[PDB]
Ligand binder design. Sequence first.
Ligand SMILES: Nc1nc2c(ncn2[C@@H]2O[C@H](COP(=O)(O)OP(=O)(O)NP(=O)(O)O)[C@@H](O)[C@H]2O)c(=O)[nH]1
Ligand SMILES: Nc1nc2c(ncn2[C@@H]2O[C@H](COP(=O)(O)OP(=O)(O)NP(=O)(O)O)[C@@H](O)[C@H]2O)c(=O)[nH]1
Ligand SMILES: [Mg+2]
Ligand SMILES: [Mg+2]
Lengths: 132, 171, 167
Amino acid sequence: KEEEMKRFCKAQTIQRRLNEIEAALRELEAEGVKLELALRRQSSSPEQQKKLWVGQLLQLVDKKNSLVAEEAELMITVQELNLEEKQWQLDQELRGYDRQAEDQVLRKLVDLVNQRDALIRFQEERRLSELA
Amino acid sequence: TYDLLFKLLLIGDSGVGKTCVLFRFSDDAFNTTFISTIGIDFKIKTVELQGKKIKLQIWDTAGQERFHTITTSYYRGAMGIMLVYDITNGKSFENISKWLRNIDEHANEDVERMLLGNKCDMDDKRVVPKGKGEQIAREHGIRFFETSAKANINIEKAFLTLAEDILRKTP
Amino acid sequence: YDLLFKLLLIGDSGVGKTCVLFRFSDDAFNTTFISTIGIDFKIKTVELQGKKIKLQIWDTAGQERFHTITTSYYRGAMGIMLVYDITNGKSFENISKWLRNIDEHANEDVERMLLGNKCDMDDKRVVPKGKGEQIAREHGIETSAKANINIEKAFLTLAEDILRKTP
Ligand SMILES: Nc1nc2c(ncn2[C@@H]2O[C@H](COP(=O)(O)OP(=O)(O)NP(=O)(O)O)[C@@H](O)[C@H]2O)c(=O)[nH]1
Ligand SMILES: Nc1nc2c(ncn2[C@@H]2O[C@H](COP(=O)(O)OP(=O)(O)NP(=O)(O)O)[C@@H](O)[C@H]2O)c(=O)[nH]1
Ligand SMILES: [Mg+2]
Ligand SMILES: [Mg+2]
């Protein structure tokens, strides 16, 4: 059960990073509000507003977005991290192995394989979406 | 923590209430102070749909057309889009065709579209019958809702319906 | 990442599948034989041709009980490798049987590669390089997980035959 501790080190680096990301997102939200008002007053012209928004507020918005994207990628790795532990328990139980109950546990194992898979396929289709 | 992340997007002409639909949904409030949107941004709200807890990243777009090119820039990732018109405003409802065409141009083919007729509280100024929005929705095979950011009519249900629709085709 | 390839290993129980995959996935080998149950897979991201490929390698359990349900995962297979151990006996008797199954269930354009594993087991080597390599020339298509040789290049080869089908 040394691997068990390894799962901790992974999980904990991840948790740390999620707190870092929450933090950075707040700092960015704060700056963003400040900037947008600075903007409102600075110029009356509407398309001038547009140019100014492209100037600074936009890059901030994308920094925000890539932060959220990273957050979601991590929250999927978490899902795999626990789907694996489940696959382990059900592996053991199957090893130990009235007649009808075992087929149920085996199919629970298989279903878990497919939830892992469904995660992989899901991020594949996301990738596809943003390429277009 | 949440299982999945959905990208949602609100489009529609300047003034029909997108910022205020989103503000009702996000913070359960409403302001009559009108600040038109410049560019694009998003708010976050997590949800629970029958055991999957999903984060909604919802992008408020700017309605005025001088932002068209920029806002269309972002249709690429969206998993669901709310087209929004104003029931008191005939212009917003006649421009639904052009909004949908932007979706065709710049969204994924895959995406879900949901139609929202905002400001259903003010029946006295209704210029568009509910049944005409229903009609076009039926003709495009998408969901329709009449909503009120002010009266809190149908906001949550529209959003959760979109999220459930996206979620259902997710594996 | 740039792209996603889904491979599958098919074989009889006792030939090296979970260990060939394990040597590639984690650069390791372990003597104990832990029978695979049902199906599994591991994920390996590699950097071929500047295109960042994500590999999803499916591991079959080649134990007669399971031969129903593992068929399920054949259609999705893009690339395949079939398990041959140099020292293993009459695991070749069933090759046609599996290859029947691929013809019976997989996608028509699926690739097929054949491996000689455990080639550190020269002393109990029963099967020359060309014993099966002439079979390989017959269909147009050696490694040790213990000594970790030609394993990495083996997989990257299959990436070659698939990504070349891409353009
Ligand atoms: N009676 C009523 N008024 C509403 C409703 N929703 C919004 N309004 C009002 O109508 C105006 C529309 O505001 P807004 O949400 O900014 O619309 P918008 O589509 O975001 N505008 P823009 O695209 O320019 O950002 C606001 O002044 C708001 O107070 C509603 O359901 N009922
Ligand atoms: N010397 C040597 N032994 C190996 C090598 N690879 C595997 N073995 C041994 O051969 C046996 C079979 O490995 P394994 O992959 O578990 O078999 P399998 O084909 O996956 N069986 P199953 O279909 O039940 O999962 C194990 O006992 C393993 O230790 C290798 O490269 N060299
Ligand atoms: Mg707005
Ligand atoms: Mg095995």
